[PDB]
Design a binder for these strands. Structure first.
Ligand code: ZN
Lengths: 50, 48, 103, 117, 49, 48, 50
DNA sequence: AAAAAAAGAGTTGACACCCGGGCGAATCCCTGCTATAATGGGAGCTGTCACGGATGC
DNA sequence: GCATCCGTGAGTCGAGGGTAATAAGCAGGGATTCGCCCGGGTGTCAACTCTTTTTTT
């Protein structure tokens, strides 16, 4: 828990390995139909915009 | 933190003659209600 | 004062049989008032025509005279639907009742 | 002491927002609740304490588990463990000191040091 | 030394701006934590961060 | 990931002030019910 | 998970079974809802066992 | 080829002490008693419909 | 058989952060609560005796 707090450079390699096939669920605020919730495969990218 | 006060808009304290446009009635007709709404006091009505 | 085995026994006995807690310390001697209270708390275990007897229903009840006197009786007349009589109903209650408020 | 009485506590249903929603009951934290990350750390420590208690002799391990309630719900004092053990009162402290010195080595207490920090 | 960061000091996310400690009452501890504390010899503080 | 929970409900607090949690709205539960997903919605409402 | 009870010196009528849309107490023994409110408010006197 | 001791155990007195239980003392909570004459109450809508039902003659 | 009157509804995620007013008095007696101190059970140490694994002869 202390290694990830200081943000060591070695933790980035473990994050890319764990996020390989784990799908995440994305949905908009006004979920009108069932298509509003669709899973994707996350990929690491810079910035703060999904 | 400074806080400003916005102006309020409400009905004027005067007499009015408003009649419904044939609504809330069994048959087509007008009521021609009159109000004596004051500034600070009990309201008055003379609906037909 | 002392707190021997006999001191607690006599104190408990005098607290159980009944006696003023203030005089409990004086009777024991030496112990003060605060000590006995702390001990008991720490140790636990802490003219008309009718008298006042022949007054039936539907009769006058306006007193005449003094109750602590020799002759004290009531009127005792036809005074139904009211405690007092008609001759005293206008002198007892507020005459000319004129009161009103909002509701 | 007369001041600071905290009279008339605020109702929990008072609307914090200007509108009717967003009451004060939502902007409150529960202090008695324990986070799952804290409980997970306790299991790791409970398991690592059993692995570290494997190189010591059986007598010292038994006396340490008797004085310190590691696997026992009720704690035992020095005299209580001495009445059940051969050493009445004195050598129990010596055995405890020897067991503590055996655990003070960095090779044997390397993984256990991260818990205190 | 007073416990406040100096003016013009660069600070990062999750930094101690003002060091404040409050007196914490005595609370029971798990036996394993007590054993670890006795092994390391450190004394548990009576104040909370 | 893990933050302070509510007082009486024992649920994660809301709002970005102190580690808020994205509210799983009522309409969002209907989306999972539309799909055949039954274990994702079962654990997302009880164990989380 | 521990509850407590409060003792009442006098009986009280449930508000749900009284002021609800269908008068549950009024449906019994053919009693109008206007008459039950008078007895509960201690306004009138009801007679029984004639 | 032989043969005794620093540790390892085992105790035996010798303090150091640390909350517990009383002895006090100092101080909180309850309860009642005050004697000229006091004699019916203050907001609140009222700028949404529409439905769906519950009383009445 | 109709006319008049009283309950339910109003999307959904996000921001924003704490609040606020009246105000009698004193005498009796108990229950409560904070300071000191003796104290007996818990720790922390000088300091006297069996065993034995060699290390020396
Ligand atoms: Zn008379």
């Amino acid at each position: 828990k202390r290694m990830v707090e200081r943000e060591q450079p070695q933790v980035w390699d473990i994050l890319e390995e764990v996020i390989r096939e784990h799908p995440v669920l994305l949905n908009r605020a006004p979920t009108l139909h069932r298509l509003g919730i669709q899973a994707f495969e996350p990929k690491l990218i810079e910035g703060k915009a999904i | 933190t400074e806080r400003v006060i916005v102006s309020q808009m409400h009905r004027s304290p005067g007499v009015f003659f408003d009649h419904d446009k044939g609504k809330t009635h069994a048959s087509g007709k007008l009521l021609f209600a009159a109000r004596v709404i004051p500034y600070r006091g009990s309201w008055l009505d003379f609906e037909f | 004062m002392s707190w021997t085995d006999e001191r607690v026994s006599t104190l408990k006995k005098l607290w159980l049989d009944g006696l003023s807690a203030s005089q409990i310390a004086k009777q024991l001697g030496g112990v003060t008032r605060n000590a006995v209270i702390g001990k008991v708390h720490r140790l636990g275990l802490s003219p008309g025509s009718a008298t006042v007897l022949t007054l039936g229903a539907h009769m006058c009840k306006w007193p005449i005279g003094d109750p602590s006197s020799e002759g004290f009786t009531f009127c005792g007349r036809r005074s139904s639907e009211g405690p007092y009589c008609v001759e005293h109903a206008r002198v007892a209650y507020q005459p000319q009742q004129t009161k009103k408020k909002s509701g | 002491k007369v001041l600071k009485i905290a009279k008339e506590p605020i109702s929990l249903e008072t609307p914090i927002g200007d509108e009717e929603d967003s009451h004060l009951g939502d902007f409150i934290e529960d202090k008695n609740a324990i986070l799952p990350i804290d409980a997970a750390i306790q299991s790791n420590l409970r398991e690592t304490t059993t692995r570290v208690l494997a190189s010591l002799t059986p007598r010292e391990e038994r006396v340490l588990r008797m004085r310190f309630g590691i696997g026992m719900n009720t704690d035992h004092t020095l005299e209580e463990v001495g009445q059940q053990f051969s050493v009445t009162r004195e050598r129990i402290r010596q055995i405890e000191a020897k067991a503590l010195r055996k655990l003070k080595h960095p090779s044997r207490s390397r993984k256990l040091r991260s818990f205190l920090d | 030394e007073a416990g406040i960061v100096a003016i013009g000091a660069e600070v990062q996310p999750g930094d101690i701006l003002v060091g404040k400690v409050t007196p914490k009452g005595e609370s029971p501890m798990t036996p394993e934590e007590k054993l670890l504390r006795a092994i390391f010899g450190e004394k548990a503080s009576d104040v909370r961060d | 990931s893990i933050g302070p929970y509510s007082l009486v409900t024992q649920q994660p607090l809301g709002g970005k002030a102190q580690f808020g949690g994205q509210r799983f709205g009522e309409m969002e539960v209907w989306a999972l019910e539309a799909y055949g997903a039954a274990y994702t919605l079962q654990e997302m409402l009880t164990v989380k | 998970e521990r509850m407590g009870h409060i003792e009442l010196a006098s009986p009280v009528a449930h508000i749900w079974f009284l002021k609800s849309l269908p008068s549950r107490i009024a449906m019994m023994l053919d009693m109008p809802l206007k008459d039950i409110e008078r007895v509960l408010y201690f306004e009138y006197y009801i007679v029984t066992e004639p």
